[PDB]
Amino acid sequence: CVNLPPAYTNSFTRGVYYPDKVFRSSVLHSTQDLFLPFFSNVTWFHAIHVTKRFDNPVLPFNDGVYFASTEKSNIIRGWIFGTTLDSKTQSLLIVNNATNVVIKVCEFQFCNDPFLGVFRVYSSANNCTFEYVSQPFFKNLREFVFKNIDGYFKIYSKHTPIRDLPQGFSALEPLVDLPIGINITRFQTLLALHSSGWTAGAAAYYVGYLQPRTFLLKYNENGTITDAVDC
C-alpha cells in the first residue's frame, strides 16, 4: 500500500453486443435495450511519459459501461466494482496476475492507489461469497461492455487487430455472466507500471456510458451483424 483536464472524443458507432442467443439470417431485427448511443462524448485517458502520466480516477457506474484500450505491452489488467470501496460493503474484482483470471467478491479494503508491477491492490479479504479463479491465463483494441441487472453481472467482449478510435463496425459476442448479487455504483481500472520510480507506459483507454434505446440491426446471410441504426 504505497502512494504515487481530460480529453473527449466521438465514439462513432460502437457497442452493439448481440442481444440474444438466437441465430438469424438475412433479416432486419428491431430491438430495445441498453445501448451506447451514436456520436457521444467519450472521455479519454493516457499513460504516456514524454509528462509523467498515470491517471486512473474513480468514475461512476451509472447503468453499465463501455470500455476500450489501444495498447501494445499489456499494461491494463482489470477492474474493481462497488459502491463505497472499503470493508463496509461487498466489492467485486477482476485481475490478471500475469498468469490467471481472478474473479471474486469480498469486503476488500482497497488502497487509494492500487497497481501491480511490470501485488498492491487490496489489504484485506474477509467474506468471500464467490470465486472464479482459473488456469494460468498500438495494435489491438479489446472492447468490453459491463452491465449489472437482476443480480446478474454481464460481460461482452471483442478483439480487433489494427491516436483515435477506428471507425469501423464490429459486434460483441457474449462472454460470461456471473451471479454476484451486489449494488454497484463506481469502478476503477487497474494498471501495471515499471515510491518514486516508474516509466515506460502507454495505455490510452477510453470509456463510455449506456442508456435505453431502440436499435435496428441487420443480419447477413451468415448470421453476422454488419450494420445498425439508432431510431
Partner: protein, 49 residues
C-alpha cells in the same frame, strides 16, 4: 416444515433476519453489512442507545 431439526429444547438462535434497513432491496441482491442503523437525525458513532 423443519420443527424437529432447526428447533432446540431451550431456544435456537443461529438463524437471523435483517431489521432496520434504510431502503428496500432489489431482485436477487444480497446484503451482509452490519452497520449501526440510525433512527433519528442525531448522528451515530458505533454505539447503541
Amino acid at each position: 416444515n423443519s420443527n424437529n431439526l432447526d428447533s432446540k429444547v431451550g431456544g435456537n438462535y443461529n438463524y437471523l433476519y435483517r431489521l432496520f434497513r434504510k431502503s428496500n432491496l432489489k431482485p436477487f441482491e444480497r446484503d451482509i453489512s452490519t452497520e449501526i442503523y440510525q433512527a433519528g437525525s442525531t448522528p451515530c458513532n458505533g454505539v447503541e442507545g
